Amino acid sequence: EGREDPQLLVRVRGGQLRGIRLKAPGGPVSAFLGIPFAEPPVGSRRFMPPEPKRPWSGVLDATTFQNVCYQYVDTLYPGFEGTEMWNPNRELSEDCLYLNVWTPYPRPASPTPVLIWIYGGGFYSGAASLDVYDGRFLAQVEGAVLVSMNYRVGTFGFLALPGSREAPGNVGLLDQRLALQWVQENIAAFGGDPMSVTLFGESAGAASVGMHILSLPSRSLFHRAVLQSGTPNGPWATVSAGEARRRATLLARLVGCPGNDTELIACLRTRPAQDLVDHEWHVLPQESIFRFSFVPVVDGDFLSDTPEALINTGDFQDLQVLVGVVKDEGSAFLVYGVPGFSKDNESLISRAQFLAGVRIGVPQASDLAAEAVVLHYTDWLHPEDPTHLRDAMSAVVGDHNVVCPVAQLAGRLAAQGARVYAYIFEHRASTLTWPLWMGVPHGYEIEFIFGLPLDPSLNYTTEERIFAQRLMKYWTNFARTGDPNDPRDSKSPQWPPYTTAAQQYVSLNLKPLEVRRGLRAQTCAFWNRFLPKLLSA
Numbered sequence: 001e002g003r004e005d006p007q008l009l010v011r012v013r014g015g016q017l018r019g020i021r022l023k024a025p026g027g028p029v030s031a032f033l034g035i036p037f038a039e040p041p042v043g044s045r046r047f048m049p050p051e052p053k054r055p056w057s058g059v060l061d062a063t064t065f066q067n068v069c070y071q072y073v074d075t076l077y078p079g080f081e082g083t084e085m086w087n088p089n090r091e092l093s094e095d096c097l098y099l100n101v102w103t104p105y106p107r108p109a110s111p112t113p114v115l116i117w118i119y120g121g122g123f124y125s126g127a128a129s130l131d132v133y134d135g136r137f138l139a140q141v142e143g144a145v146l147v148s149m150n151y152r153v154g155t156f157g158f159l160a161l162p163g164s165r166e167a168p169g170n171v172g173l174l175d176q177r178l179a180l181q182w183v184q185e186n187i188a189a190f191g192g193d194p195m196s197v198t199l200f201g202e203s204a205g206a207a208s209v210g211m212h213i214l215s216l217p218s219r220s221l222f223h224r225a226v227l228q229s230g231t232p233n234g235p236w237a238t239v240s241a242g243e244a245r246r247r248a249t250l251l252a253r254l255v256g257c258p259g260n261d262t263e264l265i266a267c268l269r270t271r272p273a274q275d276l277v278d279h280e281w282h283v284l285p286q287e288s289i290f291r292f293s294f295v296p297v298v299d300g301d302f303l304s305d306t307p308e309a310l311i312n313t314g315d316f317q318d319l320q321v322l323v324g325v326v327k328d329e330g331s332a333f334l335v336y337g338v339p340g341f342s343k344d345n346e347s348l349i350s351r352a353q354f355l356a357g358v359r360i361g362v363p364q365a366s367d368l369a370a371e372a373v374v375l376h377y378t379d380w381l382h383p384e385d386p387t388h389l390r391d392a393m394s395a396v397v398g399d400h401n402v403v404c405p406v407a408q409l410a411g412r413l414a415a416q417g418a419r420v421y422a423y424i425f426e427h428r429a430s431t432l433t434w435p436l437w438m439g440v441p442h443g444y445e446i447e448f449i450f451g452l453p454l455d456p457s458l459n460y461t462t463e464e465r466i467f468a469q470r471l472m473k474y475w476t477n478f479a480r481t482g483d484p485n486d487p488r489d490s491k492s493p494q495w496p497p498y499t500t501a502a503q504q505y506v507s508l509n510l511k512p513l514e515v516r517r518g519l520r521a522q523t524c525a526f527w528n529r530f531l532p533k534l535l536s537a
């Protein structure tokens, strides 16, 4: 042990770890990468809840990111930064249950607020080791302890035969919960305050954060939550038990597996990981965007009822949440199989291409409901205009899947006692490689929250760097105090809480905070109040 940095040896419940001193623009940070938190969910453990990592002897090397959970690697535009940056940057393995910790260097003398990141990727992809989730900046600049975990995705994480012992569903959420217990027991060793833990996440990550809010055992493992561009309620983040059974069964069938649940699961198990991935998209009931095959299941266990029912009837008195959306939630989804759309042209579509796109975006919808969406999203002054049709298509997808589900999460937590803060993120990164027409696409605020623009080698404007500092300040102020506003700062414009009466939220851009009212109030009344009833009859 004798000749290495004394500031990088830490013990956890499972044994000794050696971390790595990393360089950040302002100075050094401690990182402890690839800490096993669960027994490898391999072999007979596939589809099964995670078991706590057994203790090891000797010093575990925690200097590098560990394997990414098995997943479909995106190949829409091979070589393209815009898609590759989300693709796994470590080898794929079922042995993937590891978490990462960044802390100031030297580690803080007094108990520090902890941020826990949960990545998105439609519950079928993603990794805590992606460049855009690098905790070094928040660690260094804000003095925060940042934890991020891998969790199982796709079949391995969410395939369920509800009611069975061998494949209960929701195990990917259980991986996340186990990483949270790991933080409770171990984060004090790194100088984190386990009594001050904020979850934050984007997309499926946000939806996950939301499910932890709505699940009893998880509630005791954190104090605050941030949901970025995603919600537990909504059309994509969950499935009924019935539907999850249908999908598991169909996939079983597609890989050559037959009648009860034990035999079926044993057979799946058995199957090479790649075979499962290769067939997962085939189980979707309709041609669709923003829908994913294997997602959290309403099991009557982890989720005791539908997220809708739980937000309508829950008590959220002691909760504080920060929630928000980006300007162009839907645009990215269009290039993934809406005919008409491409990254390499303006995507000026036709009316036919729009009606076709609406069916794909609202899958789900009877002929009448589709007519409603179309009528509501058509500009009747220019009903044939390709620019507007392209933007309406984007908005349809963005509104239905993200903006409007966020609109109620907020309105609904607020009506039941939560302190809520809402934002629209409106800045397009100067470094962004998607075309202009896509505006500010799903996921493109994360790099700012994590303070990447502070890395001078990244070529961000000045400007964008000051902006990244502001957001980091809002987020860690929220983590620290349940309120993004600067306590001492007299002059800087206030971020008011979202309420049902005033419906206030802020724009996050290069200009100072501007308070707007109503989150697409008029349009979200369509998706949240009218469409459901139209779908009944």
Ligand SMILES: Nc1ccc2c(c1)c(-c1ccccc1)[n+](CCCCCCc1cnnn1CCNc1c3c(nc4ccccc14)CCCC3)c1cc(N)ccc21
Pocket: 072, 074, 076, 082, 083, 086, 120, 121, 122, 124, 125, 126, 202, 203, 277, 280, 281, 293, 332, 333, 335, 336, 337, 441, 442, 443, 444
């Ligand atoms: N021929 C085949 C064979 C197998 C599969 C195929 C196609 C497709 C497909 C590809 C193109 C068009 C239509 C379908 N998808 C569906 C992909 C749909 C992905 C939608 C975009 C998205 C949403 N959340 N995560 N992602 C994946 C990419 N990661 C991103 C992320 C984020 N933001 C963005 C923004 C732009 C581009 C990507 C992206 C932010 C959060 C995390 C990931 C699959 C999905 C599967 N689970 C398995 C197989 C296949």
